[PDB]
Design a protein around this ligand. Sequence first.
Ligand SMILES: Nc1ncnc2c1ncn2[C@@H]1O[C@H](COP(=O)(O)OP(=O)(O)O)[C@@H](O)[C@H]1O
Ligand SMILES: Nc1ncnc2c1ncn2[C@@H]1O[C@H](COP(=O)(O)OP(=O)(O)O)[C@@H](O)[C@H]1O
Ligand SMILES: Nc1ncnc2c1ncn2[C@@H]1O[C@H](COP(=O)(O)OP(=O)(O)O)[C@@H](O)[C@H]1O
Ligand SMILES: [Mg+2]
Ligand SMILES: [Mg+2]
Ligand SMILES: [Mg+2]
Ligand SMILES: [Mg+2]
Ligand SMILES: [Mg+2]
Lengths: 106, 526, 538, 49, 525, 211
Amino acid sequence: MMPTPVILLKEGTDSSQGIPQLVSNISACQVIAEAVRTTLGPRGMDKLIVDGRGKATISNDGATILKLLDVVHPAAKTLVDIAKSQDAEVGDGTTSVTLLAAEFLK
Amino acid sequence: GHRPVLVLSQNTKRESGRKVQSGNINAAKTIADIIRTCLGPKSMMKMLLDPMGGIVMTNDGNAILREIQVQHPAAKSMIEISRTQDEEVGDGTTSVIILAGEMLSVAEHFLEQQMHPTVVISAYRKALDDMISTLKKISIPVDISDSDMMLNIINSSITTKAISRWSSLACNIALDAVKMVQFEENGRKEIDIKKYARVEKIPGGIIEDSCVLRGVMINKDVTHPRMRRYIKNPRIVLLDSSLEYKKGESQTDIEITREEDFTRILQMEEEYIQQLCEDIIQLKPDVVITEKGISDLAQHYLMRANITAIRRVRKTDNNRIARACGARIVSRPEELREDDVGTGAGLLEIKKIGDEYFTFITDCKDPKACTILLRGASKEILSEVERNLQDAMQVCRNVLLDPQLVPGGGASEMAVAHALTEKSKAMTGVEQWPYRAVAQALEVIPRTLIQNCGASTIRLLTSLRAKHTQENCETWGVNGETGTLVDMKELGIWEPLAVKLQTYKTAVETAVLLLRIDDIVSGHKK
Amino acid sequence: ALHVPKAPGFAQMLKEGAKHFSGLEEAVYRNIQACKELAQTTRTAYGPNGMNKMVINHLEKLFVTNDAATILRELEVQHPAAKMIVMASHMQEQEVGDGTNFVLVFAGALLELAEELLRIGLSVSEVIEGYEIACRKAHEILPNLVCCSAKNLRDIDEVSSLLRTSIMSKQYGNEVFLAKLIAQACVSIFPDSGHFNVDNIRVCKILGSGISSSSVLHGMVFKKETEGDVTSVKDAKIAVYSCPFDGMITETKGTVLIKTAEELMNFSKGEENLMDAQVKAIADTGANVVVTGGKVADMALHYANKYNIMLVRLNSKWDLRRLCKTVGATALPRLTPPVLEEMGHCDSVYLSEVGDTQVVVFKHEKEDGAISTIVLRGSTDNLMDDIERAVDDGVNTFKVLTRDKRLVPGGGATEIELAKQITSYGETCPGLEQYAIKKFAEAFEAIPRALAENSGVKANEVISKLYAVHQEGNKNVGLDIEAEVPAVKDMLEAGILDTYLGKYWAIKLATNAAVTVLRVDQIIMAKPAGGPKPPSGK
Amino acid sequence: ALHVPKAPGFAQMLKEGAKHFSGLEEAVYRNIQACKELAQTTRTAYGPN
Amino acid sequence: AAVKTLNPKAEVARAQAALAVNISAARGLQDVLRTNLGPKGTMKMLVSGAGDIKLTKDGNVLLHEMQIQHPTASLIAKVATAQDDITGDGTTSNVLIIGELLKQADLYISEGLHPRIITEGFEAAKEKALQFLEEVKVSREMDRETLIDVARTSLRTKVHAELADVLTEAVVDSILAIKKQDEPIDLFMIEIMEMKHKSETDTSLIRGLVLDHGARHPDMKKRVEDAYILTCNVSLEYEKTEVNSGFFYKSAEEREKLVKAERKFIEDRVKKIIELKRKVCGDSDKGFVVINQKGIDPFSLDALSKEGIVALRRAKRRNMERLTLACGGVALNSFDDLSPDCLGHAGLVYEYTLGEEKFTFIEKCNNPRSVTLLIKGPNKHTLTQIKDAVRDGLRAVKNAIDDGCVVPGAGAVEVAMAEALIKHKPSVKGRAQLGVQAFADALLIIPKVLAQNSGFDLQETLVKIQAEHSESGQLVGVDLNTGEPMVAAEVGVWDNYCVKKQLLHSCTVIATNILLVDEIMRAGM
Amino acid sequence: MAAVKTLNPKAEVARAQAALAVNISAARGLQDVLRTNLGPKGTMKMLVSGAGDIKLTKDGNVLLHEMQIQHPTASLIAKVATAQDDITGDGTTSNVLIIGELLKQADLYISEGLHPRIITEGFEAAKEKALQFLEEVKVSREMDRETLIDVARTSLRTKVHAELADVLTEAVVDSILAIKKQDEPIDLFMIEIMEMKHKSETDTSLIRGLV
Ligand SMILES: Nc1ncnc2c1ncn2[C@@H]1O[C@H](COP(=O)(O)OP(=O)(O)O)[C@@H](O)[C@H]1O
Ligand SMILES: Nc1ncnc2c1ncn2[C@@H]1O[C@H](COP(=O)(O)OP(=O)(O)O)[C@@H](O)[C@H]1O
Ligand SMILES: Nc1ncnc2c1ncn2[C@@H]1O[C@H](COP(=O)(O)OP(=O)(O)O)[C@@H](O)[C@H]1O
Ligand SMILES: [Mg+2]
Ligand SMILES: [Mg+2]
Ligand SMILES: [Mg+2]
Ligand SMILES: [Mg+2]
Ligand SMILES: [Mg+2]
């Protein structure tokens, strides 16, 4: 790397490229899936999420749990979006989609 | 707590004694030293940087003094007297500053020698009276009908400026403008060049192309392209009221309940505009100039009668047009009269100069207003040229009002100093010493001229004094460009008596004002 | 003797934040390096094997795509030479629709080779003249490289085959299905008159069912709901009104002046009766569907429900104009009943729910109409955005084909042939410009090299094989990405073709940008201001 | 057009806190003024009175 | 400093310091602008604070776009701005001559000479130089070839050679189109419209007008072959009563009646237009185009489109006169009495759509006295550069037409002027001969800078050219390709006489004024 | 901006014409300061140190050391003048003036596109010719008291007041002739210079002994 007195992109731009960023994306997807694992099945359990205002949401629904999570990872938002898509088109299986996608990536 | 008890408020300073007098005199001397080098035909120019980002390249003393900011109140008084001299007679702004500084400098000597300022003030007033007497005595008459003498006077006034290169053209322009502005009505003579002698600067071209017009020139264009841009002998009608439809003064509200009332109201608006334009057309004019806006429908109705219209013109420009073309500004066209129609303009031409349109009403017969069209290198050069032309016009009007002349180039100063010394020879009281001191302090003008010329000050001043000790040598000055003593009956450098009288009076009175002062107090609010 | 002062003159007069770069090594080389960096950033997304990039702008908006123009416009490019190259790429996108990556790669290669030429001793003017001459020679050569023409545009299979290559670089896995959809949509548009309008193709993105479920509709889809109770019409008689579906009011000021009790008791009843009369007059023409651009009054809605009239409200006037085009109606300015010519007809208007969103569909039955809509299903918003970009690329390719039907081989075959011919021409030209011409020819190698690099093979082997084959006399042979080892194949049979206009404009714009960057000698940059965008950008 | 730069040469090479006075009006007259001021301070204590 | 005892926070330079500051600033400006002169000059990049990019080599544009805060720089910038405003060319030469004059004057001032003598020598040399320029100008009949040569000499110095070749034809044809015999040329009648969709060589001249706005109604025709043009300045949208009218009704029927009756005023004017259109053209063969400076409400747009009339609203004010001179009709501020004789005629009107911008073309006019140049380019900075170049070319051609005399270029006139000044120097009394020599050396800067930019060496090229001029007596300039002396008149390198006279006058005046400055003050606070 | 600034961001660099302009400006400033020193008609300069010590001088080297300058070219010229003073003991002001004028004259042609190397070659040739002419023009003579008095006057008059110079001439000539051995180098260490602060400046004299 060199100072390049006239920088190409705007200062503060962050770039990640190559196999490491793909592995990081896979790991982020695993992290997202881990947050909704225990809600699947007749022996599932509910998750409690508290927002900034103090209100608490208790839900066994994967799509609701993912939406209440403030996910900012660009690759991790894909799992939330496909959970929303499954909720909209079908209405059930919002946890199975995330588990299947994360397991494929793993 | 327990804040201190005070008689006067805080930040209230107070000096007193010899220190105040010394500080005032030093401030005046510094103010004089600022512009000491800007006097004479060999004067150098100075660049002033305005706080707004402008640049003022000038040689005039008043502009330089007014472009600076000072904190010492004596310097403020010096700036004020410079402005007073500029406003009263037009020039002499640096000579009066130098004279006041020198008078205070020579008064400091007596102030340090246990002499009360009142004695110095009385001596200064006696000296001023005798200076006025001698200046009136050594003056010469001038016939204003001789144009060559007037041109020579203006030249000698402008030899010290940057316009001396084109001195002949500058003198002709100034003389013509002053002569044509001159006007009389109801037994009242009037030479008002502030309002009726306008100087317009358009950068570009050559300064040799600058001229004074037999009319006026404004930065305006026709409201509609169809209107003629060239009329040979136009009949001009001037207005200062809108040709539009405007709301009344009272709160007026209509109430429409019928179908045809809205269209009727709009049609009556159009008909009112048409009737107004018909009242205009009844006088059969050629051009119409208004200070307020003109509606598009009004423009159409005027073009139907083949009339050129100028939409929005300033009050001062409208007054100048009225003076130049012999019109009379009116407000209600239903009261328009034939006498109000302006005939006398010999041409109305609207031509594009550079990338802007300008309206010319030149070729007037007997015009009482003029526009001095200045073309030059840039804005600063044109501004300096305008300042020099203002000085020339002020000198011309001073000569026209007061036809007396006195020798220049320090000859008047030396003659008055010699006369004052001769009169003081008979004085016996203690007042003689400051009297002689101010008499010889009046000699600063030839000394400054010699210093700026670059010659030897001491021997030239001694020879000039010896020459002035003779009988018929009151007109012997010093060249400001060759460093030699010459008789100004031959050189021809003469200046108006009014300018010299004002300069001496202002210098002496400023010296008195700053000598009267002690115990400066500062810090208080309003 | 501890500080080096600024040189007298311009160095001292410079402002506090300004920068001045003068000379070769301070301006030209720096600009070339910046342009090379930009080309390097965009290079990896070239070709069918190009990889998508997740680009996040200043508003936390994801942009996962391999569109070069989209990536460049979502990137905060600050270097002004890179700004010139980006503007050239955007101009190529606007004029043609595809080839932005080609423009950027060619400009970068040209600038690096120009830097090399300047280093070896050539002057800037000589390099510029050589590039201009070589660009003229390439433009002369290019028409001779055309292998085939469209030869038809009303066919479905032929147009799909033509458009497959353009939308093969994007969405490489499944392009035949997208090609079929785009071909059907474009064939619906483009009537017997030769004029084809890109804006006549609409894209509606509905989430949920995967992109394999996307369809094409001969009509328009609006993600709204009906105002009234009627939700389905079989023989619609749409009447379109630009005015609000409400009683007209004065534009000056409305004031109901009541002076007697009778007026007070009769005003509302008379207004309601007038509303009923107007609605019934509209209905008496057979108009069973009413579309308005403004608000809908409660009384008007009630009377429309009474007469079984379907109400659809469109806020956007662009949508109103597009609906008028689709149905053939006219936007009435008043609430008067429509005359026979102004009343549009559609074969079916109904309320439906695709996935989750409620939609209103103005469906035709004929395979015609002024406007056609593509409904895009999917599992992610970003995926549907990428598919929409691919659809835009295909539609622009169809428009270019309508403008010019000539085609050139893709897959680097055209670039290799151009490089060979330009090198042959430059080997005969005497003078110092031969070096610049040869470098311009070599700059065409960046396309097959990038394709091979993205495909995952050795670029040098591919380039050597391409030169060998083209020397043999095969001008239609290029890279074969369906192989694990460096291999080539004839692609006139494979159907991998590029538009002649696209290549022509891309070459012209890349050369123009390169020579424009080279012409610059001194840089004077003002102090960067933190203002809230220029007033031009609003 | 709002600031006057230092003249090239010695004026620019002058140190931070250093001062330079050259000529009559700014060196000789200033020195004479300072000496006159000192003499004025000490003058009043001259002689038996 | 005296003033510093009055205003402590004041910056002052006195005596030789003021001269040093002024000459340093002038030399810096000259060093920056040296590379601009001549067609072999170098492109400059100008990046603004917001990131805008400009590519120009104009002296005036560069002066306005450097980041300079110097007083003398401001003065020279104003002088160059006046030069550009009046003549339109010579700003770079202006700056170079001012700087070289100051440098040559300082070369003698530093050796004890007073600036006043230098100024006197400058005045004498300027007078002699003006006399020589009068004696050397070439009076000619300004046919197309000479104007093309002048346009080449400007545009080749401004832009690329091929773009310059195109712009020469464009500018010369436009000027010859709008020029009336024995009448001042109005450059306001040449509209410069820029489009951003094609290559820079697609710039051309349209014998008519191009409007950056189109019809606002979708049903209006996009192309009319034989069109009657109605240039009007009449509002066709609803206008409120000036005196706060308001409406008062007692029923919905009365409200409907008032709504229908409030449009009658505009409807009457629309009906007048429609009746005129019907009377003028009774078939569908001819066309009617309405160009209005004021707005048109959608009701009037629909009413006009029902009659097949193309209406354009909110046109520029200058387009009124442009259409009047081009189409040949007359702009109307009211429809009180309109007759088929108030309509202009256009042989083709069509609308062109580019992105979100719609353009209208008015071509095939009978004898258009107003034309337009359509600037086309792939970039905004290219458009700006071409606009500057065409402005310079139009100014040059107009100056050439204004006075029939034209001056040989390539620095030949400067060399001849310097030689004449050297010959005349002995006739000057006093020490002003030094100022005359300084003026001659300053005039010699143009061939020096041209040779330096072309890659040759200043001294050898200059002595070769001067020896050739002395031996032959011709007007030999600088050959930018070989460096040998060359006759500018024979090859067609021409300079504007007015530009040279303005250069001499302004440069001499500003140099004299700057040399006489002995104090720079900033004490307005 | 440049290579050095690329490697070291906090670096100060002057390249190509900038370095030449900086050096020439520094030399011209030094020459402008030291112009008034040359000749017996030169002007005294008063130099005030940080501690407040007052020094009156016209010597070129003394002035150069007490100028408040932080310029590299000024430092180089100061070192050259210091060596000049160390070996010969005179000609410092002439050294500075000649260096400044050489640089100015060289720039006069360099600004016309001429390369500095040709100017340096001309300088070498002119220096050789000037040395030959100086060898030709020198006046060889056996030096009695009169010639030494004349040389001492030509130095001291340019240093101090005329009357003080006249006294110091006799003092220095007598001292040198007193310590001088025939055909032997003169040891200036054998002349003691002692300061006393009780009389006028013209009371300085030479003691044929030691104090
Ligand atoms: N040619 C000349 N020779 C000698 N003195 C002159 C000459 N021209 C003008 N003067 C003197 O110079 C003075 C004018 O200088 P100027 O700069 O105008 O100062 P002010 O603004 O105070 O009049 C006049 O008093 C006049 O006597
Ligand atoms: N099936 C394929 N095999 C080999 N090369 C291909 C194939 N499809 C497209 N290409 C090549 O990919 C290039 C298109 O790159 P692309 O990513 O579309 O950049 P752009 O969008 O700027 O045109 C074309 O030049 C073409 O030659
Ligand atoms: N083809 C040419 N050959 C030789 N000299 C030329 C040629 N074209 C222009 N010149 C000379 O070079 C100068 C160009 O200056 P220019 O860059 O136009 O400065 P400005 O824009 O300030 O006038 C002109 O004075 C002209 O005499
Ligand atoms: Mg479930
Ligand atoms: Mg005066
Ligand atoms: Mg593509
Ligand atoms: Mg030019
Ligand atoms: Mg010595």
